[PDB]
Write a protein that binds this ligand. Structure first.
Ligand SMILES: CCCc1cc(-n2c(=O)[nH]c3ccccc32)c(O)cc1O
Length: 208
């Protein structure tokens, strides 16, 4: 059972802009995804202060970076609060309609694509380097779901019965053929040190 949805016009326009605009500084996609993981981890940390049972689905708060050269994928895994099915469908928990508007207005006032995260739509910077993105998530209040999109105006949502996660979100980037540098250990280390050196959770870079 696969459900197919149309992106709202503003989000489809944002995705087309990220895919078709000439912009060389693509590495910022990783900072944006680590930042989103950190926000998810802050949220489960805060909720767990008053209700420690929210950590029954996993006490470890961390971020893993998993490159796979054979599949040409870079996966970012976190054990944050996760997302419900309703949040996935509602632009992955983002204010994507108003955020896209504010980002578009900023771009005309002197901003560049690297400032995308300031408008709450940093997730979509994944399309600077990925031809397809799969988001697997598990929130304490819902079942495990997989969201997927190759852009083109639509996304799918399905239940995910393979590999239960416990709690959190997994973003799988199916890299564009000319963006395989982001699977190289030295390149990932460089980007984490440059843009994410002070994140408040352990970031483990897996090796092959
Ligand atoms: C999948 C869209 C963006 C994104 C979102 C999340 N995320 C969640 O899964 N729950 C969140 C609650 C607050 C902030 C970000 C959250 C994440 O853990 C990683 C991630 O890359």
């Amino acid at each position: 059972e696969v459900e197919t949805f149309a992106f709202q016009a503003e989000i489809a326009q944002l995705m087309s802009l990220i895919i078709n605009t000439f912009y060389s500084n693509k590495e910022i996609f990783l900072r944006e995804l680590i930042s989103n993981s950190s926000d998810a981890l802050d949220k489960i940390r805060y909720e767990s202060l008053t209700d420690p049972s929210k950590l029954d689905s996993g006490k470890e708060l961390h971020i893993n970076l998993i490159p796979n050269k054979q599949d040409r994928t870079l996966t970012i895994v976190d054990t944050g609060i996760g997302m419900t099915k309703a949040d996935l469908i509602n632009n992955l928990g983002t204010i994507a309609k108003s955020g896209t508007k504010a980002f578009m207005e900023a771009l005309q006032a002197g901003a560049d694509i690297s400032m995308i995260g300031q408008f709450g739509v940093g997730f979509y910077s994944a399309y600077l380097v990925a031809e397809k993105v799969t988001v697997i998530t598990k929130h304490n209040d819902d079942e495990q779901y997989a969201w997927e999109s190759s852009a083109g105006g639509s996304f799918t949502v399905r239940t995910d019965t393979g590999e239960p996660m416990g709690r959190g979100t997994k973003v799988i980037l199916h890299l564009k053929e000319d963006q395989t540098e982001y699977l190289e250990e030295r390149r990932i280390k460089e980007i984490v040190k440059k843009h994410s050196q002070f994140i408040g959770y352990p970031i483990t870079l897996f090796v092959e």
